[PDB]
Structures are given as structure tokens and as C-alpha cells.
Amino acid sequence: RVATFRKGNYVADLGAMVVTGLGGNPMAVVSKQVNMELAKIKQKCPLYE
DNA sequence: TGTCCCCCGCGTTTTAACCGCCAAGGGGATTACTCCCTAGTCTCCAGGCACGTGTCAGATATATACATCCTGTGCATGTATTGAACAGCGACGAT
């Protein structure tokens, strides 16, 4: 259930890509082991009707 | 110590206390007289007190239940502190 759409320069994850933090998460070590570029999420989410 | 008000002092206004003098009868003081009541005396005896006794109302000891008195937990709420998640600005490389 880990799917990633790769075509040319377009990258998009159809199942798994975001995590819920690095504090205590073994994913932090996985990121230190496997080349993972981690980008923070800006929680600003505007709403339009 | 601090406030508010309750008397104190003083001038002006109002009242009746006080004094002086006369007029009158109510009642207290005083006397004379009579008898009813109480002190004094005697004899008579039961009402009242000492003495003895028997016992139950009450003091004492011991066990339990009730009251209460006070301090120590809880609660709840407000506030202070701290962590985290919004927000720079600039230098760099990739496009």
C-alpha cells in the first residue's frame, strides 16, 4: 500500500507520503538511513466555499 | 487612626417658679369613760420530740452509645510559566 507515481519529473504518492512527526518515530532513523528529503507541512489551509 | 455626630457653650425667647398675704375647714390631737381582752394563775394531758429500726432512693463503679470539635484531606478556579507552532531575512544553488 505504498504507491508512487513517477513519470519524467512528476512525483506523486497515491497512498503513503506524509508522516506524523519525528519525535519517537522510528521513521526518523529510516530517514537517516534511506535517502529521504523531508519537507515540513505549513498548516495554513484557507477555505473557499 | 479616622470619621461623623452628639453634646457644650451662648444669645435670645418663653414659662412658671417663688413670694407675699388672706381665707377656710379638714382632720389630727387631746380627754373623759367603759368594757372587752389579755396577762397571770392553776390543773389537766396529748401533741411533739428522742430513740430505735428497717429499707429503698440514691450515690458509686464500670461499660457503651451520642455529640462535637477541630484539623486535614479532597475539590475548584485563577494565574503564571513554558513549549510549540505560526509568522521574518538573507545566502545559496538549480533552472
Curated annotation (Swiss-Prot):
FAD binds at residues 1, 17-18. Induction: Down-regulated during neural differentiation in neuroblastoma cancer. Acetylated by KAT8 in epithelial but not in mesenchymal cells, thereby regulating the epithelial-to-mesenchymal transition. Acetylation by KAT8 reduces KDM1A association with nucleosomes, thereby decreasing histone H3 demethylation, leading to transcription activatio of target genes. Polyubiquitinated by JADE2; which leads to its proteasomal degradation. Deubiquitinated by USP38; preventing it from degradation by the 26S proteasome. It is found in: Nucleus; Chromosome. Ubiquitously expressed. It comes from the Eukaryota. Belongs to the flavin monoamine oxidase family. The SWIRM domain may act as an anchor site for a histone tail. Histone demethylase that can demethylate both 'Lys-4' (H3K4me) and 'Lys-9' (H3K9me) of histone H3, thereby acting as a coactivator or a corepressor, depending on the context. Acts by oxidizing the substrate by FAD to generate the corresponding imine that is subsequently hydrolyzed. Acts as a corepressor by mediating demethylation of H3K4me, a specific tag for epigenetic transcriptional activation. Demethylates both mono- (H3K4me1) and di-methylated (H3K4me2) H3K4me. May play a role in the repression of neuronal genes. Component of a histone demethylase complex with RCOR1. Component of a RCOR/GFI/KDM1A/HDAC complex. Interacts directly with GFI1 and GFI1B. Interacts with INSM1 (via N-terminus). Component of a BHC histone deacetylase complex that contains HDAC1, HDAC2, HMG20B, KDM1A, RCOR1 and PHF21A. The BHC complex may also contain ZMYM2, ZNF217, ZMYM3, GSE1 and GTF2I. In the complex, RCOR1/CoREST strongly enhances the demethylase activity and protects it from the proteasome while PHF21A/BHC80 inhibits the demethylase activity. Interacts with the androgen receptor (AR). It is linked to Cleft palate, psychomotor retardation, and distinctive facial features: A syndrome characterized by cleft palate, developmental delay, psychomotor retardation, and facial dysmorphic features including a prominent forehead, slightly arched eyebrows, elongated palpebral fissures, a wide nasal bridge, thin lips, and widely spaced teeth. Cleft palate is a congenital fissure of the soft and/or hard palate, due to faulty fusion. ACTH-independent macronodular adrenal hyperplasia 3: A form of macronodular adrenal hyperplasia, a rare adrenal defect characterized by multiple, bilateral, non-pigmented, benign, adrenocortical nodules. It results in excessive production of cortisol leading to ACTH-independent Cushing syndrome. Clinical manifestations of Cushing syndrome include facial and truncal obesity, abdominal striae, muscular weakness, osteoporosis, arterial hypertension, diabetes. AIMAH3 affected individuals have low fasting cortisol and ACTH, but excess cortisol is secreted after eating. This is Lysine-specific histone demethylase 1A. The chain holds residues 316 to 364 of 852 of the full protein.
